[PDB]
RNA sequence: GUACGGCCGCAAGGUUAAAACUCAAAUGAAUUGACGGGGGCCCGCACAAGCGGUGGAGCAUGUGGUUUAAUUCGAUGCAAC
RNA sequence: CGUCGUAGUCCGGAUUGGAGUCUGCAACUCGACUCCAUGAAGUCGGAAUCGCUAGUAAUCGUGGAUCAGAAUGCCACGGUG
RNA sequence: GGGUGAUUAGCUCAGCUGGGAGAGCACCUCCCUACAAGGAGGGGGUCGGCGGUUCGAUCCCGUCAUCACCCACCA
RNA sequence: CGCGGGGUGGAGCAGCCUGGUAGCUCGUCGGGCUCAUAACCCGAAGGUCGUCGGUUCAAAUCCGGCCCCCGCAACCA
RNA sequence: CCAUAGGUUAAUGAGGCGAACCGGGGGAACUGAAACAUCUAAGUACCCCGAGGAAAAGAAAUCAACCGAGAUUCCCCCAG
RNA sequence: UUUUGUAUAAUGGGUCAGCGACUUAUAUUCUGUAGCAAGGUUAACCGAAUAGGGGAGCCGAAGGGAAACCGAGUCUUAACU
RNA sequence: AGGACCGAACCGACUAAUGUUGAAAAAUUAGCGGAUGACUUGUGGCUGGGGGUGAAAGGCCAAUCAAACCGGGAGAUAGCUGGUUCUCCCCGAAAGCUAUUUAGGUAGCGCCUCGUGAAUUCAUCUCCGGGGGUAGAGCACUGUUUCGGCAAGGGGGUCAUCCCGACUUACCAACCCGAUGCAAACUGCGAAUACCGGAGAAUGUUAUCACGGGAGACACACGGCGGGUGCUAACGUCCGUC
RNA sequence: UGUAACGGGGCUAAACCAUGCACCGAAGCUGCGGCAGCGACGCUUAUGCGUUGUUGGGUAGGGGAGCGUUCUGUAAGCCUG
RNA sequence: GUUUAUUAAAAACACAGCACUGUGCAAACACGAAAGUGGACGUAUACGGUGUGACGCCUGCCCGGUGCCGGAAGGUUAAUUGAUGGGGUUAGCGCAAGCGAAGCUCUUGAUCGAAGCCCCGGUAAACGGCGGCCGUAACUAUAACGGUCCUAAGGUAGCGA
RNA sequence: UGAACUCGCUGUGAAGAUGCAGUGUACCCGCGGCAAGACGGAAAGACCCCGUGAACCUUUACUAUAGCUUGACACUGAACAUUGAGCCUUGAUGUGUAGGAUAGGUGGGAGGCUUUGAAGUGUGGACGCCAGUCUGCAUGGAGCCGACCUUGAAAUACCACCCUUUAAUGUUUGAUGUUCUAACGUUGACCCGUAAUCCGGGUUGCGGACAGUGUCUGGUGGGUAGUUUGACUGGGGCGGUCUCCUCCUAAAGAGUAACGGAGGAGCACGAAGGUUGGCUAAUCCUGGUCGGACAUCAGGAGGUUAGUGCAAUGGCAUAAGCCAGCUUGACUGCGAGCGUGACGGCGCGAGCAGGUGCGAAAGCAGGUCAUAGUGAUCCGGUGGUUCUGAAUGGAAGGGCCAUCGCUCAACGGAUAAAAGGUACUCCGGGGAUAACAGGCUGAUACCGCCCAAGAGUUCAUAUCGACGGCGGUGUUUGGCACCUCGAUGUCGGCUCAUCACAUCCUGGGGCUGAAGUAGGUCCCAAGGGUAUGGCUGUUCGCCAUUUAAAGUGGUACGCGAGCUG
RNA sequence: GCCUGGCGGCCGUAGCGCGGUGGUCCCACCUGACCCCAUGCCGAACUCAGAAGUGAAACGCCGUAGCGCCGAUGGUAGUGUGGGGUCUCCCCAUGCGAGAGUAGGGAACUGCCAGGC
């Protein structure tokens, strides 16, 4: 709601971006919590945004 | 040196100019103090600047204020506590 | 000489009871001196301002007056300067 | 008549969580000095009428009395 | 009609919105400068923050009631 | 100065009028979009000019698709 | 005629007479009906102008999937289901 | 002499009367306002529509003007007011539930019917049963409130900050308890009826289902009962049910 | 406006009431004369009849018939000076 | 003097007078597709315009807004030009999809560059506008005076229901 | 000019009846006069509302443009300076600074060069911070240098190489400022047309590279055009309302009304999510130094009373409330399937494929106790992609799959997107919608009674009267919409009626707080009679006064085919 | 037959209070712990090695009704369906109908299994 978003980026080759809206107003910390891709379906890492 | 009309003037104003009401002055010449917020001569540490301060704490002793049945009068900076 | 600090202190002992000591109708209230105990304040201090020129300022003891019985106030004395 | 306020000392007005009356001026007395002015002490209270409550109404409720103000035909 | 503000030791307003929290310039009394009051510099005392509650760990502010005020204003059968 | 503007004359053409279509210039509103401004209505209605039996178009700087067609135009399809 | 509603003063009617409104195209589709039937049809053209000639075109018997692609199946999908 | 006063010609309208199917789409009378002037008048010309002309009125521009007069676009446009013409039979509605750029426009669903097919179709009543939460009832619980009991808290009054603060009061008043209660937004609880399903007894000039053609319908009136609503007024308004 | 608030006349039980019996009163109940239409049972037909039941107020709308008239044909006809 | 021909006859409009201002002449200005006219056969005691209204008293403040007059440093900023980056093609590289120079070529839009705009003084006989609350003087009262909030100014003079 | 044979009244009444009900009354008809009625006659009515009406008018509504104006460009040239940017030809910049020492910087560093040349004191020209450089005579005639020591970021044979600022010569360019002139002008003259009131050509004078104009472009732009201002508002309006969400109204079957009742939502939390095992409030009492004041740890009472991200509601330990360990299931494709609405739309879920997490395991896990936290279509861009890509090889383009973005919130998006004036008003609807006479109603007003604390000497009731109760008239003013806007004309002035009686006067009785006189009051009675001025439009009201008395209500608040304005 | 435990079926007539009784099988307390497991400290809690001591407490059994709980019968509120009466209420005919209270009940029921005496 009204926040900015931001794609994380995959520590390997993946077509997805998975977007975030995390909030940062106080939690200046990295978000890491591995998803599920359906290509090479092994999950996926996650990392880089707000 | 003034209200309302004349007379002049663009106007102001000039010109003509008092009374009612009412009070101890109004006015010209000189003089003794006081005194600068004048300018000069003198002075006090006033200035210059030195060594020491009060107010806070504790204690003691006076003066005022206020209340109540008493909680006294005078001093009025220096020239009173 | 011994001893001690930036600590409201070794200190101070201001305050509060209990004992007494003195003088005196009488010290409860308003007096002084003493002891076992307890125990607080003071580490410059308001706007702002005070005072004299050397034995003067600054500072510590001694004495007297008043007085049955107490001053730190009153009048004097000398030391350090 | 209605509405909004005021209604405390003669003339003008502050109060107080209901404990109890007050100042200026006047009518007086003393202090400061002959007075102004000032300080202090007094003289006089329907705190408007009548009900409700209370042991008590400046701080409450109703109903009135009076004053300043407002209401209103024509739209 | 309908709308928008103000109420803060005695006076008149900042403060509020942004939460870690009660004020300024005067006023009153008492000082400092003085022979003295002003001008001026200091010291001191006192807030139902209109006021009853709500809400919260927590305010005057959040917020409903009960009152007191102003500004725009009556610009429609 | 020769010339030429200006002036004179002759020969021929143009002018003006006409029904509709047509070529160039100028060109709406209402209507539909269930509003309304792009769009539509519509280059239509109407006005100016010119011209022909028609105007226009024309004998590929055409397409087409590596395979081919072979000036233009009008009608039916392509295709709602 | 008009509204929930009309004795209604609610609009219309002097009277006769004459007049006074669904006509008409195309494209499409359902319904009815009829020929023909897995078939049914020609447009423009021009003609023995209702016949006949003219198959370019049109609809129907196949669908599924952006599309490539597949087909009584297909797409979705890890997948029979 | 005269942007003076009188006043006929001429020009112009302050009042009263006449006239507006009047003689007339501006003329008439009786007292008049002006009358060498910024005068008035005969005659012709020049100025044209979103433009003229105006000591400037949406005045004047030939009876006409917030764009005149004539024609064309034109048979403008009108969710609106309206105009539509002999004899007859069968079956027979709706005014509820929604949406809209939506309010007398339009639209989904709903009942009626024509076609064809199926059907003891479909409903009344009984037996069996489910959601119930109204009518009513209750008061632990949620809110709320009358009268009392015990007793904090707050205002008022006095002393304090030592006892982990008491004392008091012609105010206000909580937590809890006794007596008594009210309730849509409370529940210790809880119908008649209604509805719909399961099954069955009884029955019919057909009750209904499904697919394909046409639809039609929401501006509603009056009044109880159940309730809001107004004033438990209205020939007043919203909604169930008849 | 004029009685006007028994509908009028008129009221004394012609008002009111208990119980009972008779009476008037429509397209309802009972009948007579008709038009169209229909279920059951039984017989019969390229469709009716009997025995026995039984329906017909209707707007919106849906469905299905009848009469008249213009014109052309029917019409070189038929009717007729 | 002028007027809404038929509901207004006037205080309106006009007008003597006035301020402010534009205009140096091929004037400013007006007509208007643009010439040629009109201004004017005038030339700064000439011509244009606005409003107020002859004659006598005279005629204040606010430059915040908006416009006009004037000013140019600093910043925003168009046409124009086409830096750098993406693509196609071409030389290049390799066993390949694909990668990869100049020039050609499409694209992106670096830099260039003015006025207005962001600016600042003057101007209100330029339009337009020009305040509340409270205290305070020998009964009551009022407030010349002051306190305070506040603005671009707080509306002067005169006149005043 | 429906027909008519058309009487008055009371009631009914689509609520103002000749025609319905009840009832009363009346010879018929010309003719001259008078005039209530036909909601009389003339008018597609003024005012109000409504209409996805109409024009004209305005502009902090929306959008654009002629014009004016900025710059770019050209028609449009010459020269120089002023300053650059661009630029030729020949030469030149160089020291900062310590000791010797003028080292420009920089890469290289024992090999390398001159005979048209240096040497040395003499003259002389030039650059010069005087260290030296450089041509060239007097003049002769191939050398000469460096290493180690040494300064300094850094050497000094020798070579590649870069730049400063500028004169003169050559010069591109946009401006500034003069000058020149062929462009251009003449708004001068002259010559001729013309012994022409147009202006054509020519020659001259004087200006002068501009005016003017078209393409690009910034600005401004009502002069000019086109358009809207949503829906509801128990007539119109100010304020409110428009989407989602709980409890209740809402009818013991369901959606649900009225500007109905108590409130909220446009977000929050990567943790407040998943999961294993546990845990159990709150509040109050007791007691414990530094302790104003709630402070600790333990005991007791006690509990669907604590808490739940936020609102209202329902639930609560099988905890959905909080505590420790570990974690991504805030998963991708689907799904026994099941709900709700007319539709778009929108709620739940066993299970399985792939992978994951907690757990010993059963089992649970694709977010949160739960109901709200919403925004399609179309489109500007973007990664993946041979799916496709108009001659085909590429790309660009079209699609798919990932994706960013509206307060379109008037929420189901008429459009990213729009406000005002009209008494010049016009046109069509509407009484289906307002005030107005009537009706309904009687809240309101006016008025009667019941009750009667108190007033009034005593004393309720002579004359008054509280707190309240029960009614009356239609009689003021409110409420309705039932008749009108398809004409039923308003205020004051005035000639003129008539009915009712809550009676002003007389006529008659009773009481008194009535001795007499004179007033106050009550019920009983309707016959006549019931006044004049100032200001003002006045009704009215205030002011000024009469009379035996100068009363009140009803009649469309009687009285414009009655007059006045 | 009775007892003690469990799986339960059932969970307001097994509940609240009041008075007795039991260690045998069982259980609770309880013995001990740096051993398995454990305290965010504590063997409290939960374990693990168990019987020395009891029946304190908890637990089971049993009595006792003032009550929660169970509760007739009748009536009342309420009412479907017809109708009466100047009528948002009253009255009736016919068909239904609580909650609360009263009489009274009542200190749990029951199937399977192991062990005890």
Same mark, same amino acid.
């Given at each position: 709601?009204? *926040?900015? $978003?931001?794609? =994380? @980026?995959?520590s390997?080759? +993946?077509?997805?971006?998975? +977007? +975030?809206? $995390?909030?940062?107003? +106080? $939690?200046? %910390?990295? =978000? %890491? =919590? $591995?998803?599920?891709?359906? @290509?090479? *379906?092994?999950? @996926?890492?996650?990392? %880089?945004?707000?």
């Amino acid at each position: 709601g009204i *926040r900015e $978003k931001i794609k =994380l @980026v995959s520590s390997a080759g +993946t077509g997805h971006f998975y +977007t +975030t809206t $995390k909030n940062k107003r +106080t $939690k200046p %910390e990295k =978000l %890491e =919590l $591995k998803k599920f891709d359906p @290509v090479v *379906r092994q999950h @996926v890492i996650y990392k %880089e945004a707000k």
